[PDB]
Write an enzyme that holds these catalytic residues in place. Structure first.
Site, short mmCIF file in Angstrom:
data_model
loop_
_atom_site.label_atom_id
_atom_site.label_comp_id
_atom_site.label_asym_id
_atom_site.label_seq_id
_atom_site.Cartn_x
_atom_site.Cartn_y
_atom_site.Cartn_z
N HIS D 137 16.98 -99.97 68.07
CA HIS D 137 16.96 -100.86 66.91
C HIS D 137 16.63 -102.28 67.34
O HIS D 137 17.49 -103.18 67.35
CB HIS D 137 18.29 -100.79 66.17
CG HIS D 137 18.22 -101.38 64.81
ND1 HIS D 137 18.96 -100.89 63.77
CD2 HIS D 137 17.50 -102.41 64.31
CE1 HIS D 137 18.70 -101.58 62.68
NE2 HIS D 137 17.84 -102.54 62.99
N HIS D 139 14.22 -105.64 66.84
CA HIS D 139 13.24 -106.46 66.13
C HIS D 139 12.49 -107.29 67.15
O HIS D 139 13.09 -108.09 67.84
CB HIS D 139 13.91 -107.35 65.11
CG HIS D 139 14.61 -106.58 64.01
ND1 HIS D 139 14.17 -106.58 62.71
CD2 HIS D 139 15.68 -105.77 64.04
CE1 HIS D 139 14.96 -105.81 61.97
NE2 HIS D 139 15.90 -105.31 62.76
N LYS D 220 9.96 -96.93 60.27
CA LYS D 220 11.18 -97.51 59.72
C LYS D 220 11.00 -97.65 58.23
O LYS D 220 10.10 -98.26 57.64
CB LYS D 220 11.37 -98.93 60.25
CG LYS D 220 12.51 -99.71 59.60
CD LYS D 220 13.90 -99.11 59.85
CE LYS D 220 15.04 -100.00 59.38
NZ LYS D 220 15.06 -101.27 60.12
N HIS D 222 12.94 -99.39 55.19
CA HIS D 222 13.85 -100.50 55.02
C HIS D 222 13.88 -100.92 53.56
O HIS D 222 12.85 -101.09 52.91
CB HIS D 222 13.38 -101.70 55.89
CG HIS D 222 14.43 -102.74 56.08
ND1 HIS D 222 14.92 -103.51 55.06
CD2 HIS D 222 15.14 -103.08 57.18
CE1 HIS D 222 15.85 -104.32 55.52
NE2 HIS D 222 16.01 -104.06 56.80
N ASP D 224 14.14 -103.74 52.28
CA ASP D 224 13.39 -104.94 51.99
C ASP D 224 11.92 -104.66 51.66
O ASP D 224 11.27 -105.51 51.07
CB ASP D 224 13.48 -105.94 53.14
CG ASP D 224 14.89 -106.55 53.31
OD1 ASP D 224 15.88 -106.12 52.67
OD2 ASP D 224 15.01 -107.48 54.16
N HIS D 249 17.12 -97.83 56.80
CA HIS D 249 18.04 -98.83 56.28
C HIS D 249 17.91 -98.65 54.78
O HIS D 249 16.88 -98.98 54.20
CB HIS D 249 17.63 -100.22 56.79
CG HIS D 249 18.32 -101.38 56.13
ND1 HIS D 249 18.71 -102.51 56.82
CD2 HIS D 249 18.63 -101.62 54.83
CE1 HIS D 249 19.20 -103.40 55.98
NE2 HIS D 249 19.19 -102.87 54.77
N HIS D 275 22.58 -98.64 61.57
CA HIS D 275 23.80 -99.35 61.16
C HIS D 275 24.54 -98.61 60.05
O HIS D 275 24.74 -99.12 58.96
CB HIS D 275 23.55 -100.82 60.78
CG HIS D 275 22.32 -101.05 59.95
ND1 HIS D 275 22.13 -100.50 58.70
CD2 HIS D 275 21.21 -101.76 60.22
CE1 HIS D 275 20.95 -100.88 58.23
NE2 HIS D 275 20.37 -101.65 59.14
N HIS D 323 20.39 -114.12 54.41
CA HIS D 323 19.82 -113.62 53.15
C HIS D 323 19.61 -114.77 52.18
O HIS D 323 19.20 -114.56 51.03
CB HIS D 323 20.74 -112.58 52.49
CG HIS D 323 20.64 -111.21 53.07
ND1 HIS D 323 20.43 -110.09 52.29
CD2 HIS D 323 20.75 -110.77 54.34
CE1 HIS D 323 20.40 -109.02 53.06
NE2 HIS D 323 20.59 -109.40 54.32
N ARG D 339 29.36 -105.48 50.72
CA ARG D 339 28.64 -105.10 51.94
C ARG D 339 29.42 -105.27 53.26
O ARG D 339 29.23 -104.50 54.22
CB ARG D 339 27.36 -105.88 52.01
CG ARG D 339 26.55 -105.53 53.25
CD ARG D 339 25.05 -105.60 53.06
NE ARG D 339 24.43 -105.82 54.38
CZ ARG D 339 23.16 -106.13 54.62
NH1 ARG D 339 22.27 -106.23 53.63
NH2 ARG D 339 22.76 -106.33 55.87
N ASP D 363 20.13 -104.13 67.01
CA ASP D 363 19.62 -104.90 65.87
C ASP D 363 19.18 -106.29 66.31
O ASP D 363 19.32 -107.25 65.56
CB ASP D 363 20.60 -104.97 64.68
CG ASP D 363 19.93 -104.94 63.35
OD1 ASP D 363 18.70 -105.20 63.23
OD2 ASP D 363 20.66 -104.65 62.34
F LIG Z 1 18.12 -104.80 58.36
F LIG Z 2 18.97 -103.65 60.71
NI NI Z 3 18.74 -102.88 58.85
NI NI Z 4 17.40 -104.24 61.82
#
Ligand SMILES: [F-]
Ligand SMILES: [F-]
Ligand code: NI
Ligand code: NI
Ligand SMILES: [F-]
Ligand SMILES: [F-]
Ligand code: NI
Ligand code: NI
Lengths: 100, 570, 122, 570, 100, 100
Positions: D137, D139, D220, D222, D224, D249, D275, D323, D339, D363
């Protein structure tokens, strides 16, 4: 903080000056890089204080005297050059023959 | 449903008629137009618009009008306008400026700006986005100078040098075929666009031309190699054949001629006059008169920009130090007093504001500061607003005219001068995606993210060990565009047509994108965007007073600048 | 004359979103036991099955709220929302796979919604 | 002649029945078996055993059962056991685990572990040796994150991103063929193994699949980008054809569905649930119930690991910051409270200890810490020992069962999940020689030496100007495995079968070792070593209380952790 | 010492704070990077002292006031974020609007 | 100044020692890297002062005691090694078991 490359480098000059100042305070005659660091940091801090380039050209010759440094160090240092941000932007200060 | 303007600007960045202060200057830019459809703004994140079936299209393959990258809600500052738009990038180039998203459900989507599976997103809401700076006066002296340049939003370095050799410490010159080949190879590891200048000196054509054929992108005539009538003439004959630009640092000493003699040697041919004010070099005291001529593309270097209370003291000594002059040699003292002149430095501020000097440049490490071209451009514009007022051309309130005049000085105009504006120098469809994002509070001071060929190359970003990238220390850092072989695809080596035709890139194993220099010889002052003024500049040989249209051009030096002690740690 | 670096000086007036598009108010309830939050640009008929509303009134529409915002329904919460019309080609693909084409095909959309248990197909 | 045990362990490292404390934790590992022949231990130095005609064979050429590298006297901690052995490496792979030396004169030499002219030696006596960590995981946001990872013993980074673009700052996604190609090229300069995930979003197959063919190693999904039923479905259809893994996710907002709807879309297909506790993202509040299912490979990210007194305060605000939430928007506050939940974070500790959550991950830089996956694994195990006692499975005194359960979480299990365990993820014959040496006092905190493909890539080492390498400052530094073209041979780029078959490495000029992703679609929870438990996890929608087998899973947060202020300068 | 990459970087924050503190002590109004450095170092030292994240979120708003900094600096700093090793491991502290 | 690579690195040791000394002065028990930094900087400054290698081998065992450091730190530090420029050039000092 948004540090640029020069800001990062120039932190090291301040640090070296702080080191040198501690050495001077415990009674040591300063060496070549120590003397350069002290005078350089003085210039940069002076710019930060808002002094003029001309003031710093003069003052830089009175920061260290020959009794503060090892034999030969005054003659090793022909000049010290430093750039810093003055109230009117970056300028170059050259201190000629800073230690007589 | 309606949103008040303050809240709208906070969420999406400013829209039509809104103004934004440039850093801590007195300069305000106003949004002229906006390509969005209100309510269909693109944005990315949890529960936001750019999601599959919504603002992101889920149907089209990459080839089918989909973008590799969308910058959402950018405030563009460019010679072409000051306006709000999404910017779409594909194959490393800007392919659309307009409105991105999904035509399935949104109104007003520019047809080739589809956000699809293939699309990365950069949020530009609340950022000012400019073209990467084009610095055409670079001495290649210390590789650490590249990050310095990137941190202040420069993306192209044109100039010369081989490192800290005396020739290079004095002149923007990489001399001869072998040094040129070596520096083309070195360039493979520099994360910035590059073009290399050869030595514009000789009395026979072949020694000069072989540099162009070896891969030089231009020539530099410099007095330290003999800026004689012959070297001027031969360089321009070569340039006219080769379609590359010539830069000149003229004969300060007036040894072989005065300004008029240099102009006679040029004989109406196109030339880029470096540090045209002359503290950085040139016919004493009247070199700046070059900037009145139609065949001259005039640039300043940055240490005289703008005129401040420390400028003269600093330069008189800078000159003495770097030329190894002695206070006890009367010739050297008279030389310095003839070269460093408040009268011409003050006039230089005004000539910029009038559009008579067309370009800025650094002179990096050879009487100039690698990371202050953009910075000092805006400090000049701010000083001129304070001292001369809003320009007559301004539409009430804003400084848009001035902002377009000044942004052109370090983006489009140097690109046009060098014959590279087909690739770089402005935010326009069809050009390479060299883009700089700025927070307005840091505008012109410290770039947020520098995009090179569509991938971020440099960014102000924090702790690499942290949970998120914003914790301290936030500092400028090289990003993935500079790593591995991606450095080849995100940067351009600009070269002469002849070297490209002769296969120099293959011969040397160059993997970078290869850019062709062209259309350098058929341009003039009239082609300098927002800075196209020709006039008779008179410089009094006794007093150094500068006159244009019978008016003395003078202004005062300032004690303080914006974009200075509020921002810098040293 | 205090300088806030980079500050805005916004113009007067207000920005009307989704101007010229038909607006529709409907009541919606979260019949589930976990919170449901709905973004501005999701085809409204394709939201979570356990939201109860007149599903037909969600076809070809989305929330009339600022781009990138959302409406939140706590468990058991019923409230009114305002919808606006989708634009562009007025086609929807993916999401819950209820449309996959023109939003004009109301019968097909509702047939799929009903078969899959999306509450409120009348 | 006999040697007492204390002296034996001091000279050769521990042997059968001896225990070693893991850093400053309460965890003890016990040597289960030892491959040596007492008296014939290998060691290197002046007057030591590995000398020509003695423990080094002087006859055999490299091909003739001779090793390139022998690690002497290693204490191996691996899912396969906790035991003492020499480890032999050849052609960059582990070729023997057993007893090295010279069959001329020593008893018990493993036949392909001859120390010969060709053999380098690393002394592992008194060190714990593990497989390199597999972080699935990641980025890719800031290249400085690589050294951060190496310093805590991570050797493979799987994830996505293009640098500090908003898409990448939110999601492990390198979207589309062009961004994937660019990041494959960037990877040539990253001194760590890498696999890249494409965007698992779309409603048509082709836009998703073309990412796999371009060189992505997985996908992935996600929220978003829209974690909708359609994007889930299409991604898994692609993955089943391509034999790559999908990470998810899920839809925290429950916008298009609740957990059961996501599970219906998955339709029994294999998926890696990132996660899984959900503070890092997913169906509120019950996402963690995913970890009970047989087709789910569940991982945690590290900031919730383990549950501490600062965790909630830190996360509630972390969430708000990243966020861009506002305290004065009631929806955003309710969102955060839904959350970030102590009830599920506390249960997550226990679910790890029970073998119900199978994997750890970072992450990195998007709600996770690049250099703390290994660190926090052991802090979790230590907390669980303190709060729950020795596991029932332990054989008196030692924490071996727990240690194998927990080491599996960041070594073998992520490798199996990603389809790369044929190459990496454990200390086994036939696998790539990615090995981490730890001093027990620094175990899990700061790696001593990180071996990549059989050459040291990273080390804690001192003054480069000193007479020996141990004087201060001792800091993490890149070693010769990262320099020049050796970076190509010491690291693997993992890619899809289809991209390999289609010649992507040659097309892009990739020089790194190319690893094939395979056997990802035919696995399940049962395949997670030491962490194979399936069960019905109930999460109360009102109280967020977690129950397994009718028992509430709860534990207290701790005020202090080991592997913390004793070690770190900040 | 076994310094990792973050430990090396974060030494620079301490140094910049020491520099800024010397500038403040000689009477200068502090600038943007100076103010950020001081508050950041305060957070990291507070973690080292064993304060909680919540304590530091509160205290960080009282380290510098508007009279300690140049015009516009308070409005330039929306928040300061720092990670440090607390007694319970690394945590993130965010100080919101640290200078009113 | 003409800093070479080691001079640049070793400035960081001085800085880390200064940090650690501030932590000690406000009453904290020092951790592993803090203790190492303090003793290392002491050695390097001692060389600068003109002490002998043998003097520093002895003195280095009396810079910090077990009550100055956290539990386990004395046993974590088997020795501390540092090179510095003595009056007679660079030499290596090894302090064995510096904290009992
Ligand atoms: F995320
Ligand atoms: F994540
Ligand atoms: Ni995530
Ligand atoms: Ni992530
Ligand atoms: F020059
Ligand atoms: F110049
Ligand atoms: Ni010049
Ligand atoms: Ni020059």
């Amino acid at each position: 903080m948004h540090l640029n490359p020069a800001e990062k480098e120039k932190l090291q000059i301040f640090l070296a000056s702080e080191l040198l100042l501690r050495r001077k305070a415990r009674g040591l005659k300063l060496n070549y890089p120590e003397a350069v660091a002290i005078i350089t940091s003085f210039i940069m801090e002076g710019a930060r204080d808002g002094k003029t380039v001309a003031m710093l050209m003069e003052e830089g010759k009175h920061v260290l005297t020959r009794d503060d440094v090892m034999e030969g160090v005054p003659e090793m240092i022909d000049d010290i050059q430093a750039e810093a941000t003055f109230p009117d932007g970056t300028k170059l200060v050259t201190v000629h023959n800073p230690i007589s | 449903m309606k949103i008040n303007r303050q809240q709208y600007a906070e969420s999406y960045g400013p829209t039509v008629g809104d103004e934004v202060r440039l850093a801590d200057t007195d300069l305000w830019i106003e949004v002229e137009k906006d390509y969005t459809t209100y309510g269909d703004e693109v944005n990315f994140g949890g529960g936001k618009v750019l999601r599959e079936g919504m603002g992101e299209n889920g149907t089209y393959t990459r080839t089918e009008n989909v973008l590799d990258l969308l910058l959402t809600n950018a405030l563009i500052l460019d010679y072409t306008g000051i306006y709000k738009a999404d910017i779409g990038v594909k194959d490393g180039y800007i392919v659309g400026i307009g409105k991105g998203g999904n035509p399935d459900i949104m109104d007003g989507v520019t047809p080739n700006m589809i956000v699809g599976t293939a699309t990365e997103v950069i949020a530009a809401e609340g950022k000012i986005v400019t073209a990467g700076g084009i610095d055409t006066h670079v001495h290649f002296i210390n590789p650490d100078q590249v990050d310095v340049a990137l941190a202040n939003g420069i993306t192209t370095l044109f100039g010369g040098g081989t490192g800290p050799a005396e020739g290079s410490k004095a002149t923007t010159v990489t001399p001869g075929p072998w040094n040129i080949e070596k520096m083309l190879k070195s360039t493979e590891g520099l994360p910035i666009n590059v073009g290399i200048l050869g030595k514009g000196h000789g009395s026979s054509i072949a020694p000069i031309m072989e540099q162009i054929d070896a891969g030089a992108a231009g020539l530099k005539i410099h007095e330290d190699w003999g800026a004689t009538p012959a070297s001027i003439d031969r360089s321009l004959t070569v340039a006219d054949e080769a379609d590359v630009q010539v830069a000149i640092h003229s004969d300060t000493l007036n040894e072989a001629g005065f300004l008029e003699d240099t102009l006679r040697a040029i004989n109406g041919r196109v030339i880029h006059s470096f540090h045209v004010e002359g503290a950085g070099g040139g016919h004493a005291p009247d070199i700046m008169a070059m900037a009145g001529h139609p065949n001259v593309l005039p640039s300043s270097t940055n240490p005289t920009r703008p005129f401040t209370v420390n400028t003269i003291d600093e330069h008189l000594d800078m000159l003495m130090v770097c030329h190894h002059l002695k206070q006890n040699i009367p010739e050297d003292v008279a030389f310095a007093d003839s070269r460093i002149r408040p009268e011409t430095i003050a006039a230089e501020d005004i000539l910029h504001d009038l559009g008579i000097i067309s370009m800025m440049s650094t002179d990096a490490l050879a009487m100039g500061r690698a990371g202050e071209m953009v910075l000092r451009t805006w400090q000049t514009a701010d000083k001129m607003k304070k001292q001369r007022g809003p320009l007559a051309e301004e539409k009430n309130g804003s400084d848009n005219f001035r902002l377009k005049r000044y942004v052109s000085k370090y983006t489009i105009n140097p690109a046009i001068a060098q014959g590279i504006a087909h690739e770089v120098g402005s935010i326009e469809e069809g050009k390479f995606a060299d883009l700089v994002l700025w927070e307005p509070k840091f505008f012109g001071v410290k770039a947020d993210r520098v995009i090179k060929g569509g991938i971020i190359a440099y960014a102000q970003i924090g702790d690499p060990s942290a949970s998120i990238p914003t914790p301290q220390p936030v500092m400028g850092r090289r990003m993935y565009g500079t790593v591995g072989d991606l450095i080849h695809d995100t940067n351009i080596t600009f070269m002469s047509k002849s070297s490209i035709q002769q296969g120099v890139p293959a011969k040397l194993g160059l993997k970078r994108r290869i850019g062709t220099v062209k259309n350098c010889r058929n341009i003039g002052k009239k082609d300098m965007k927002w800075n196209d003024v020709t006039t008779d500049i008179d410089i009094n040989p006794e007093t150094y007073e500068v006159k244009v249209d019978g008016e003395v051009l003078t202004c005062e030096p300032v004690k303080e600048l914006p974009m200075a002690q509020r921002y810098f740690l040293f | 004359n205090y300088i806030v670096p980079g500050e805005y000086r916004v113009a007067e007036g207000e920005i009307e979103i989704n101007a010229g598009r038909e607006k529709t108010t409907i009541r919606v309830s979260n019949t589930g036991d976990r919170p449901i939050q709905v973004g501005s640009h999701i085809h409204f008929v394709e939201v979570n099955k356990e939201l109860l509303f007149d599903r037909a009134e969600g076809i070809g529409r989305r929330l009339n709220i600022p781009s990138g915002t959302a409406a939140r329904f706590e468990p058991g919460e019923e409230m009114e929302v305002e919808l606006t019309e989708l634009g562009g080609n007025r086609e929807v693909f993916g999401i819950s796979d209820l449309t996959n084409g023109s939003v004009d095909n109301k019968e097909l959309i509702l047939q799929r919604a009903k078969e899959l248990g999306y509450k409120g197909v009348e």
